[PDB]
Amino acid sequence: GPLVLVSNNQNIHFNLSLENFLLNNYNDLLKYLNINTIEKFNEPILFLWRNNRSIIIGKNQNIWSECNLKNIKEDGVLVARRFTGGGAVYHDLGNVCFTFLNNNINTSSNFLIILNTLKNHFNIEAKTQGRNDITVNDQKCSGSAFKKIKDVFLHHGTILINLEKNILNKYLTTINLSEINNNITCENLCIALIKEFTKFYEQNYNTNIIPNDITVHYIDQNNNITKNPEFLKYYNLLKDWDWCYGKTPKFQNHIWKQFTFGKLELFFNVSNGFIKDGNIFSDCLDINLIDHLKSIFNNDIKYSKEDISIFFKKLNVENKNYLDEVRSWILQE
Ligand SMILES: O=C(O)CCCC[C@@H]1CCSS1
Numbered sequence: 001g002p003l004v005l006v007s008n009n010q011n012i013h014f015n016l017s018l019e020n021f022l023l024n025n026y027n028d029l030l031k032y033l034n035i036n037t038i039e040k041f042n043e044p045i046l047f048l049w050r051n052n053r054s055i056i057i058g059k060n061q062n063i064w065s066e067c068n069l070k071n072i073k074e075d076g077v078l079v080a081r082r083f084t085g086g087g088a089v090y091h092d093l094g095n096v097c098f099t100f101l102n103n104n105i106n107t108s109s110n111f112l113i114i115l116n117t118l119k120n121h122f123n124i125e126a127k128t129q130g131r132n133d134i135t136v137n138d139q140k141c142s143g144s145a146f147k148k149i150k151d152v153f154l155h156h157g158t159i160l161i162n163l164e165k166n167i168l169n170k171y172l173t174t175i176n177l178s179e180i181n182n183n184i185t186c187e188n189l190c191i192a193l194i195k196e197f198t199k200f201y202e203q204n205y206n207t208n209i210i211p212n213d214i215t216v217h218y219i220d221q222n223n224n225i226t227k228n229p230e231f232l233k234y235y236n237l238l239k240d241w242d243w244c245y246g247k248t249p250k251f252q253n254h255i256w257k258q259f260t261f262g263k264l265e266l267f268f269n270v271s272n273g274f275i276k277d278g279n280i281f282s283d284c285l286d287i288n289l290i291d292h293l294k295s296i297f298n299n300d301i302k303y304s305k306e307d308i309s310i311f312f313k314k315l316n317v318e319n320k321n322y323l324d325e326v327r328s329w330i331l332q333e
Pocket residue numbers: 056082085086087088089097098132143144145156157158
């Protein structure tokens with residue numbers, strides 16, 4: 001059956017390591033949890049967690065362009081780079097973080113669980129603006145990001161309860177707190193959200209036969225999860241400097257553009273009419289698309305409209321419209 005997991009830890013790197021461990025051990029979680037030893041997992045998961053003062057960048061973002069590191073270090077704010085796409089965001093105990101894991105893509109349904117939460121339990125009429133945002137009065141109150149894997153889909157986003165709104169501009173080189181509209185709390189919102197989650201996945205069953213129960217697991221101390229060598233690997237990587245701050249290597253040429261789906265920046269070198277090495281920074285949610293773009297580097301492409309066009313024809317991506325637009329951009333510079 002579905003799972004509700006909670007982490008009382010408040011370190012961004014620790015909770016991100018938990019999240020990555022759940023994504024990378026989905027079908028086996030029932031063993032890492034002490035529930036079952038044989039049966040393998042395939043049901044929905046909701047994981048709730050909070051983090052102290054932090055800046056989380058994005059798998060493909062440039063730290064130096066989004067963050068004013070001086071004030072971050074001066075104010076003792078932690079820095080991290082997540083595995084999903086999106087822009088740089090700030091975290092503190094005034095905001096909640098949710099992580100939906102599913103067998104198939106479940107974005108819309110997840111957003112429906114959240115909207116049902118706000119409406120039913122707080123009379124907050126909320127709308128979803130784009131693929132990844134929730135507004136209440138055309139003002140952002142939640143922000144999501146996604147990652148896909150063979151058997152797992154991960155939709156993890158942030159909900160704003162009592163976040164310090166003004167402090168943001170100190171670190172990120174409008175927002176609305178859901179307290180401006182209600183007397184909500186992290187515990188209140190969380191409980192309501194678990195309710196609408198279990199209830200959402202209890203439709204098929206008839207109520208008269210099934211218990212009206214809720215179950216909550218706590219994993220921040222589950223030694224099977226947090227004492228694993230894989231977990232420590234993730235934690236150390238996220239704590240590492242080369243990962244968060246990325247790579248400095250310079251590059252000969254650099255192009256850029258602002259697309260509806262986010263900004264794109266290509267750095268590349270060319271030797272003997274061939275695209276030698278390169279790298280892509282972006283603000284995009286479609287990380288798959290961007291890695292497929294990265295496949296252009298360190299391969300033998302003649303740096304010609306012909307060979308480039310061919311190379312784009314060779315790709316089979318999730319979003320073919322975005323790819324068409326991006327190639328139509330590259331062939332002009
Ligand atoms: O607005 C965006 O670009 C999505 C923000 C997603 C932030 C991540 C939710 C929990 S960790 S960071």
